[PDB]
C-alpha cells in the first residue's frame, strides 16, 4: 500500500537502540508502527470485540501481593523444572503461527537462536503451522542445552500427523503440545477486514496418541476445571490453561482466573502432583508471571511479546525480551521476600477481589456533560 | 367538491381539518389521539399535509381508524403554494444530498460488512435525522438501553474441549414451529423511515429468501398493511408473527386479531410494556397517554383475548419474575422479557438479568415447560444469543440491527445480517464445545459476576489532572 | 470581567424558548454559560473534590426498578401530604442562600411566584440567609394555597433568632427546618478561587426550641440513622436526610443510601409513623424522586435545579421546572404500574447492587496506549 | 599535585578514576555500589564530574563512605574543556529558561494556593525533568502509587450532628512527644533537586517556623548532612526523626545511629521495604542490588539494633499484618504501613487497606496498645488523614506534597502546606462532629465498600464507537 516508504524509513534506523527498550510493551509499540497491515492484523488480533484478549491481561490486576519483609534476598533463584527438563527461567516462548510475516528473513529460526544465544535458555514451542520446517528450526538452535517442544495441530488426514509426530521425536523435540481449542480458527476480524486442524478431536484420539509416542503430551487450550481433571484421568503430562490468546471464543474467562479455581480442586482430589498446569495469555510483566507461579502454574507462556520482539529485532530482540522479563521476575522476587520458585506459594497473594470483574452502569451523559470540577492554580500571564 | 380557503380556514388545534391526497378530513377528534403525539398534525393542520402522511402510513389506516363521518369530500385541486407540506425531516437542511452521496454506492459492497455494528455505523451516517433519532433513541437519558447489552458482558463462558464439534445444528422450535435459527426480528414501527420504497416488505423478503429463514414479528404501527408484508413473503415456509397493542375501542382490536389470523400469522405478541409513550428526548429535541394503546389493559383483558383467538398469545414487555409467573398462571403461550428496547421506563433492568432470575424460579415452581420465555434488547453478537439460550430462553430478538441493515441495504442487507449472526452463533457453538441448541445448558456459563452492576465513586479530577502516565519508547525521529 | 458582553448577548435572546427546555439539566447548562463567575461558583460548588456532591446523584443509579405490567394506569395521582398540609407533587423547592446572584431583580420572591403561579403548588423553603426579607418573600406568594417553610440557621445571639421564629410564625410560615449540618460552612473551593450560624447547636437547644413554638420542627442535615433515631426520641416532626448539597463534609454518604438503611430500622423500632423523613441532593429526574419515595421519604427536595431555572427564566423558569419534574414523576408511575404515592412501596425496586460503590484499580496506561481495537466499515472515497 | 591526562586516562568502567572539586578519587570499587546505579558515574568517569556531584550530595559523604586510600591527591588545576561536566539534567534543552520564567514570580502568590494539588501542578511545570521524573515516579507502570490514594476513596463518613464542635483540638502524641498536628513529613532523598539552595534545610525551617510545627523525618540519602538540617531547625520545640537504611558494612550504620542520637533526633525509622531498588521507568526513560542498602537484613538484625540504641525504632515499609505482629513481638516502638510511595514492588496493596485489616487483629491479639502504627502513601486531603486516624493509625505521613511545596515555594511553601492541611483537618473534624483525635474512632466511618477494588471487563469499543449521547439545549447562536 505505498506505506512501505514510511515503514522502512521508521524501521531503518529510527528504531531505538535495543538497549533502550524498557519493557515488553515497547516492542509492541514498535512492531505496530512498522509491520505490514497484513502481519500486525494477523499478530495483534483477537476473536471480535476482543474482550477475553484484554481480559486475560487485566485479570492479573484483580490480584495483589502481600510481600514479606526482612527476609534475606541477596540471592534469588528463578529456575524451575518444566516437563522433565530443568529450565532457567519459569516462562517460555509459546507457539505463534507463521513467524515470517514480521521477520521474513529467518522466521522462527531467529526465535530458536534468541532463546539460546545469551545467558538464558527459554523453552521454544513450535507451531505445526510455523513458516519454517521443524528440521530448520531445531537445527537453528544455538545449544544442546536449550529445550524445544512441539505443538501439534492434528490433521484430518491422520497419517500426515502420524508421520509428523515420529519425525519430530526423531528431530529431538522434548514434548508434544496438542492444541485442542481450535476446532475451527476463531474470527479474527482485524485480518478479515484486509483479506489443517481436524474438528473431530476427542479424548480417545489423545488416548491413542499416548500409546503411539514416548514424548510427554500436554493438552494446550484447556478452559474449565472439568477438562483439567479429564486431562488427568486420561494420563497426559500437562494441561496449558489457555483460550488461545483470546483469539478463539470471545467471552472466555481469563486463564489466571481459571487457575485460581482449578488448583484447589486438584488438591482436594490430590491429583495435583500428577499434572503440570501451565497458563498463558496476557503476561506482559514479571509480576504477572509471579501471580501465575504463586497460584500453581509450573511455567507460564507468552506468544505476542516474543513475536513482536522477533519481528522488530529478530534473534537479538527475542534475547532481549528474555533478559527484560527475567529481570522483572528477579527483582520482584527480592521484593516479594522469596528466593526460589518453590517458595512462591498462594499465601504471598491477596485473592479477595479476584472476582471483582465488573461491568458498569451507563455513564450519565448529561449530568456528566454539564458538570465541571475543581481547577488547579493558574500561573501569572504577567 | 368542497372549496380550499373554507377548508384552510380550519387552521386550528382542537377544531382542526386537513387535506390528505385529495380528500378532506375533519381531524379535530383525532388530533389528541394520534400515535406519535398530536403536535405533528397540529403544526400542519388546515394545510395539505399529504407529504408527511402518504410515505409514512400503513395504507389502510384512514379507512380503518377515521370514522367515516369525519371523512369529508374532495378538495378542489390544490391547496395554494405554501399550503402543501415539505416532507418530514424535521431538522434536516439541503443535507439530503451529502447523505445521498454518502449513500451512493459509497456504501461498502455487502461482502465487506463484518458485523451488525457496521450497519449501525453506516445507517447513522446515511439516515435522515428524524429516522436516526427515531430508530436509535431510548427513553430518557438512556441507561436501560445501553445496559440491555452491557448486561451480557457480565456473563462469561466455560467451554468444553475435545468434543467433536463437526456438524453443528442451530435450529430450534419456537412456539411450535421448527425454525432455522434461534433468533427473530422484533416489531418496529415505521421501517419506511429508513427504507422508504419497501419498508417492512423488504424485511419480509430478506428473512425468507436465503437458505436460512427467520421469523418476522410485524408491528401494529408498521408503515405497511400486514396484508402486503405477508403477501411479499418470498418463501411459503417462513414464519410471521403479529404484535398487537389493544385499542381502547376493543372491537377494533377484535377486528385486528381475526383479520391477521386469516392472513395466517402464527402467533400474537401483545405488547404490554407501553401504556404511556416513553419520553425520547433526542426526538423531542429535534421537533404520552392516547386511546390507541389503551392504558387500562389488565390480566383479565388477556384472559378474554384467549377465548377470542386460536393463535398463541405471548405477552411481550414483561419486567419481573412475578409477571412471568402470573402469565404462566393465566396460561398464555409465552412471555417476552423485554423493556421495549429501553425506550419506555428508564432504569428498568436488563432482560438477561431478569431471565437469570426467573428461570430457576420457573423450574422450582414446576411451570418451566409450560411457558416459552423469549428475551430481546441489547443482542448484537452470536455469543449474546448463546448466553440468552444457555439460560433458558427459547428465542432471542432484535429490533435495531434489522432496521439499520434494512435501511442501508434493503433485503439483501437483512439477509446478510441473518447470515452474519447465524455464522457467529455456529462458530461460537463449536468453540463452546456443543452441537445442538438443546445442548446449550447453564452449566456452560460463568454467572459468578452476573450481578456486578457497579456505579463507581465520582472521582478525582485534580488527582488525575496532575497525574502523568508512563510512556512507550519513541522512534528517533517519528 | 468584560464577559458581561458575552453574557448579555447569550442571555438576551439567544436563550432557547422556555418551551424548549426538556429537563432540569438544560437549565443548568444555560445558567452555566450566562451567570456571573461569582454566582455560578457560589451556586454550583461542592466541598472540594466534590465527590459527595456527584455521589448524591449517581447513588440513584445503583437502584433499578422492577415494574408491574397490565395494571390499570389511565389515572395516576402524585399528591401527598407533607408536614400537616397536603401538597400537590412529592418534591419541594429547597432552601438556596442568596437567590439574587443570578436573579438580581426579584431574588427569592420569583421562586415564591413560580411555585404558585401555575397549576401546581410546590412547597418553598426560605433561607435564614435569603437575599430578600421573609416578609417580602411570603408576601410575593400568588396563593393562600401555596405552602412555605422556614429554615432557620440559629445565631449565636440567640435573641436574634428567637425574635425571628416568632416573626415568621406570625408571617404564617408552615414549619421550621433547623439546618444542623453547617456548624461552619464547608470549603467551596470554586468560590474561594475567585473571592450567622452558631457552632454550638446541640440536641438540648432543639428541645428548648420545641417548647418555644407551635410550628413543626424538622432537623435538616441528618446523616446517619443514629441521629434520625435521636430526632425521634426528642420529638421533632421530621428529619431531612442531607449533607447540604455535598457542600459541607466531602466523603459523606449519599442521602438515598442512608434512607435505604435508616427506614428498616425505623420499622424494627416502630417509630416510623412518628417521623417524616425527607431526602435531598442529586435529584434531577422524576425517577430519582420515585426511587426516594419508594424507599420511604415523605417528600424529596431540590436546591440547584430551581436555583438555575430561576436565575435563567425567573418565576416562569421555576414554574416550568415544576411542570417538567411533575411530568417525569407522572409518566414514570404509569410505567412503574402504580397510581398513588402510597402505592410506591420498596418492592417496586431492585436494591441488590445499592452498595456497588466501587473505586477502580489504576488504568494500565501502557497496555491501554499500545492496544487498538476493532474499526467499523469505511465508506468508499470513490 | 597529580597530573590531568594520567588521571583522564582512567576513563573506563571497572577501573574508573574521577575528579570532584580538586581532589582525585579512584572510583573503581565504588562504581557498582553507588546508590542511584553506577551508570551516572560510568558515563562521566575520567572527567571532572564536580558539576553533578557538588549540588547533589550530603556534603560529608566522600569523607564518610570513600575509604581514604581511594582519596587521591590534587589534580593540577583543571581538566581540559570538555572534561568538566554540564549539570545533571538529563534530557533538558535550553529549557531551563522557559521553566525559569514560568517560575519567575509567575508562580501564583502563596495566598492563592488552595490545596496540596496546586503545589504538584506548579512543580510539574517549573521542575527540571530529572527532578520531576525522580519525585513523581512510581515503580513500574505505577498501579500501587495511584491505588495508595484511590483506596481512601473506598471509605466514606458517618458524621454526627448537633454536637457542639466549637473548639477543635487536632494535637496528638506520636512516639511519646506531643505533636501539634496528626501528620508528619516522610523521608525523601535529594530535596536539592527541586530546592537547590537549601534542600532539606528549608523543610526543617518550614515545619518549625509557624505556630503549628510538624515532625520531620530525615532520609539517609538526603542531600544535606543531618548536622545542618537539625542545626537549621527554627524552633527548639519541633521534632526530627532519622530514617536509616542499614549498610552492608554494619559498623557504618552503627556509627550513623550514635551520631544522629547525639544530634538529638527523636526516633529511628528503619526502612525495610527497599532491599532491591524499585524500577522507575520514567527516570530510566530519561537517562537494583547495592551494598549500601544491605539486602540480607532480617528480624535478628533489628533485635541487635535495639541493644545498640536508646531511641525508639520504627520499622518503616511493612506490607502485611504478619509483619506487624512480628514487629510487635520483637518489641519495636512502631511500624509504618508503607510500600515506599509505590516506587518499590508494584501490585503492593494500599496501606489504608492494610491498616483496616490489621487493627482488629492488633486488638484481638491484645498487642494494640504496644505498637504505634503510622501509614503513608497517597494522603492528599485532610479527610484522608481522618480516615487513617479513625481506623487506628497514630500519625499519617506525606512524601511528595512536601517536596512539591518545598521545591516551588521553599520554607513558606512548606508552612503553607502545613497550614492548608491542618485547616482541612480541623474543618472536617467539625463537620464530622468530633473535637479530639481521640474522638476519631471507627464507628464514624463507612467501611462497607472498603474492599471494592474492581477491574471491570474490557469493553466494547464498537458498541460505544457508534453510540450517540443525549444532548443539552443550545443557545440560538452560540
Ligand atoms: C388520518 C389519521 C391518521 C392515522 C390513522 C395515522 C396513524 C398513525 C399511526 C398508527 C402511526 C405510527 C406512530 C409511530 O411512529 O410511533 C402514525 C405515525 C405518524 N403519523 Fe400518523 N396518522 C394519521 C394522520 C396523520 C397525519 C394527518 C399526519 C401528518 C401530520 C401524520 C403523520 C405521522 C407521522 C410523521 C408519524 C411519525 C412521527 C415521527 O416522525 O416519528 N399522521 N400515524
Ligand atoms: C564519591 C562517592 C559518592 C558518594 C558517597 C555518593 C553518594 C550518593 C548518595 C548516598 C546518593 C543519593 C541517591 C538517590 O538519589 O536515590 C547519591 C545519588 C546520586 N549521586 Fe552520588 N555519590 C558519590 C559519587 C557520585 C559521583 C562521582 C557522581 C557523579 C556522577 C554522583 C552523582 C549522583 C547523582 C546525580 C545522584 C542521583 C541520581 C538521580 O539523578 O536521580 N555521585 N550519591
Ligand atoms: C500471531 C499468533 C498466532 C498464533 N498461532 C498459534 C499456533 O500456531 N498454534 C497454537 O497453538 N497457538 C497459536 N497462538 C497462540 C499461542 O501461542 C498462545 O496462545 C499465545 O499467543 C498466548 O497469548 P499471549 O500472546 O496473549 O500471551 C498464536 C498466537 C498469536 C498471537
Ligand atoms: C424504532 C423502534 C420502534 C419500535 N416499535 C415497537 C413496536 O411497534 N412495537 C413493539 O412492541 N415494540 C417496538 N420496538 C421495540 C421492540 O421490538 C424490541 O424489543 C427491540 O427494539 C429490542 O431492542 P433492540 O432494538 O435493542 O434489540 C421498537 C423498537 C425500535 C427500536
Ligand atoms: C447555592 C446554594 C446555597 C444553599 N444555601 C443553603 C442555605 O441557605 N441553607 C440551607 O440549609 N441550605 C442551603 N443549600 C442547600 C439546600 O437547600 C439543599 O441541600 C440543596 O441544595 C440540595 O442539593 P441539590 O441542589 O443537590 O438537590 C444551598 C444550596 C446551594 C446549592
Ligand atoms: C522522591 C522520593 C524519594 C524517597 N526517598 C525515600 C527515602 O530516602 N527513604 C525512605 O525510607 N523512603 C523514601 N520515600 C518514600 C517515603 O518517604 C514515603 O513513604 C512517601 O513518599 C509516601 O508516599 P507519598 O509520597 O505518596 O506520600 C521517597 C519518596 C519519594 C517520593
Short mmCIF file of C-alpha atoms and ligand atoms in Angstrom, two decimals, chain D residues 134-135 186-189 219 243 245 271 316 338 340-341 343 376-378 380 398-400 403, ligand 6:
data_model
loop_
_atom_site.label_atom_id
_atom_site.label_comp_id
_atom_site.label_asym_id
_atom_site.label_seq_id
_atom_site.Cartn_x
_atom_site.Cartn_y
_atom_site.Cartn_z
CA UNK D 134 12.51 11.47 40.26
CA UNK D 135 9.96 12.97 42.63
CA UNK D 186 8.30 11.42 55.34
CA UNK D 187 11.95 10.89 54.33
CA UNK D 188 12.78 11.90 50.82
CA UNK D 189 16.01 11.58 49.02
CA UNK D 219 16.43 10.44 54.96
CA UNK D 243 15.34 7.24 58.63
CA UNK D 245 18.88 2.09 55.70
CA UNK D 271 13.36 1.31 56.08
CA UNK D 316 9.05 1.71 58.05
CA UNK D 338 4.06 1.81 53.75
CA UNK D 340 7.65 3.33 49.80
CA UNK D 341 5.32 5.69 47.86
CA UNK D 343 8.11 3.03 43.89
CA UNK D 376 1.69 6.92 54.47
CA UNK D 377 1.39 6.99 50.82
CA UNK D 378 -1.41 8.58 48.96
CA UNK D 380 -3.57 14.47 49.94
CA UNK D 398 3.47 12.65 53.37
CA UNK D 399 6.30 12.31 50.89
CA UNK D 400 5.59 14.14 47.66
CA UNK D 403 8.72 18.14 48.01
C1 LIG E 6 11.45 11.30 45.81
C2 LIG E 6 11.14 10.23 46.82
C3 LIG E 6 12.23 9.63 47.39
C4 LIG E 6 12.00 8.93 48.53
N1 LIG E 6 13.09 8.51 49.26
C5 LIG E 6 12.84 7.79 50.40
C6 LIG E 6 13.96 7.67 51.28
O1 LIG E 6 15.04 8.25 51.18
N2 LIG E 6 13.79 6.86 52.36
C7 LIG E 6 12.66 6.19 52.61
O2 LIG E 6 12.54 5.38 53.55
N3 LIG E 6 11.67 6.45 51.68
C8 LIG E 6 11.58 7.38 50.71
N4 LIG E 6 10.45 7.88 50.05
C9 LIG E 6 9.18 7.46 50.24
C10 LIG E 6 8.60 7.69 51.64
O3 LIG E 6 9.10 8.63 52.47
C11 LIG E 6 7.20 7.92 51.80
O4 LIG E 6 6.61 6.73 52.19
C12 LIG E 6 6.36 8.78 50.92
O5 LIG E 6 6.89 9.10 49.71
C13 LIG E 6 4.95 8.31 50.90
O6 LIG E 6 4.31 8.46 49.66
P1 LIG E 6 3.62 9.74 49.08
O7 LIG E 6 4.82 10.48 48.55
O8 LIG E 6 2.64 9.21 48.11
O9 LIG E 6 3.03 10.38 50.30
C14 LIG E 6 10.70 8.68 48.95
C15 LIG E 6 9.64 9.17 48.27
C16 LIG E 6 9.84 9.97 47.25
C17 LIG E 6 8.58 10.29 46.53
#
